[PDB]
Amino acid sequence: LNPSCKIMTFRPSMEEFREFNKYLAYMESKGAHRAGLAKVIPPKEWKPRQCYDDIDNLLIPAPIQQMVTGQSGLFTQYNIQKKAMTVKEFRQLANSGKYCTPRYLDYEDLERKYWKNLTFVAPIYGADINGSIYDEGVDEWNIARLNTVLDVVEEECGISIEGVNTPYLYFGMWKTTFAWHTEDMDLYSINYLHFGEPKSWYAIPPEHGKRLERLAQGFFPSSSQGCDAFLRHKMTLISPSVLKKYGIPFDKITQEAGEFMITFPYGYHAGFNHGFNCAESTNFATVRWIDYGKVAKLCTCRKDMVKISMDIFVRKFQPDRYQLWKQGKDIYTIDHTKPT
Ligand SMILES: CCc1c(C)[nH]c2c(C#N)c(C)nn2c1=O
Numbered sequence: 001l002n003p004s005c006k007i008m009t010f011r012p013s014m015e016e017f018r019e020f021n022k023y024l025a026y027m028e029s030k031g032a033h034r035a036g037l038a039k040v041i042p043p044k045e046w047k048p049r050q051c052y053d054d055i056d057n058l059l060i061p062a063p064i065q066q067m068v069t070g071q072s073g074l075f076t077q078y079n080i081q082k083k084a085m086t087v088k089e090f091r092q093l094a095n096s097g098k099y100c101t102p103r104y105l106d107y108e109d110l111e112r113k114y115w116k117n118l119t120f121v122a123p124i125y126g127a128d129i130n131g132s133i134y135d136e137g138v139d140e141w142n143i144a145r146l147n148t149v150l151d152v153v154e155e156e157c158g159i160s161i162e163g164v165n166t167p168y169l170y171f172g173m174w175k176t177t178f179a180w181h182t183e184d185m186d187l188y189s190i191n192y193l194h195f196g197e198p199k200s201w202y203a204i205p206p207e208h209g210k211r212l213e214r215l216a217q218g219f220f221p222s223s224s225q226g227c228d229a230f231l232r233h234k235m236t237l238i239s240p241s242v243l244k245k246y247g248i249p250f251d252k253i254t255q256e257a258g259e260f261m262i263t264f265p266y267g268y269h270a271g272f273n274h275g276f277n278c279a280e281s282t283n284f285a286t287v288r289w290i291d292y293g294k295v296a297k298l299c300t301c302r303k304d305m306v307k308i309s310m311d312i313f314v315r316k317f318q319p320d321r322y323q324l325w326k327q328g329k330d331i332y333t334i335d336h337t338k339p340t
């Protein structure tokens with residue numbers, strides 16, 4: 001299944017698309033998860049929102065200015081908080097001469113310009129804004145209620161899932177960056193690009209994730225000393241030139257407005273926004289995730305990082321293993337290649 005581990009693009013008919021959980025089972029049956037990342041283009045007629053005009057009025061409480069330092073494919077970034085502004089003000093800022101997308105020939109050209117210009121003007125973004133902007137009543141692929149095993153454990157068993165299964169908005173401009181990371185607890189994520197300019201992605205197959213970790217520890221030995229899972233800080237940038245040089249396998253793809261990207265457990269991803277845009281995302285889980293969550297290597301640094309107790313998931317979905325697990329005896333290494 002997908003021996004190349006390349007990013008797959010899916011084009012479901014309305015009939016296939018209707019049921020998210022079933023279609024996701026189908027994607028993995030084709031080996032989509034080997035790449036760490038997949039794209040799903042919904043059928044043309046499907047619209048999660050009739051009109052986006054009102055989103056201009058939404059407030060972005062804490063826009064962040066992204067300060068990047070380093071050189072030649074290896075960078076670290078930190079955040080400066082700016083004053084609140086409406087999406088409309090943010091779009092006008094994004095479109096100004098100081099912040100707008102440069103002229104470019106094709107995506108390959110724009111990508112070169114991204115990596116060449118990272119340490120000049122510092123771009124601004126709004127992230128982790130709570131809420132979904134789907135219309136009421138949209139029942140397909142509704143990011144606010146995907147009904148995965150996360151939801152079951154929360155609603156049926158009353159277990160806190162720490163807010164990770166709720167929907168968040170991101171408002172990008174040119175050159176705003178998501179640094180290399182896997183999801184909290186090595187969950188899945190889903191990202192829909194509502195409107196605006198594209199978002200480019202890089203992804204490393206989960207089966208090669210440890211090689212990215214070893215390369216990062218080698219280039220960022222300071223960061224590494226402070227925290228065993230320092231890539232979860234989302235402050236570490238590493239270019240595809242550097243990946244190619246040290247032979248870490250990866251793939252790239254660009255997401256356009258109206259398209260979904262799914263990231264899979266332990267699928268390291270990074271990327272950047274082409275221009276002003278708006279994306280909605282959340283985390284979710286399936287049963288195949290449970291063995292990733294049990295071994296996910298967590299940040300020790302700060303007091304507040306997301307940790308979900310695995311107890312309920314092993315007890316309910318892996319009852320055969322539960323006591324072995326609680327006795328520290330459930331030892332395995334994950335097969336990243338097979339469906340569950
Ligand atoms: C620059 C704002 C921003 C952040 C911080 N992270 C992410 C992810 C992730 N993961 C993606 C898909 N987009 N996105 C963003 O636009």
Ligand SMILES: [Cl-]
Binds near residue numbers: 102113117
């Ligand atoms: Cl530029």
Ligand SMILES: [Fe+2]
Binds near residue numbers: 181182189269
């Ligand atoms: Fe992510």
Ligand SMILES: [Zn+2]
Binds near residue numbers: 226227229233299
């Ligand atoms: Zn940490």
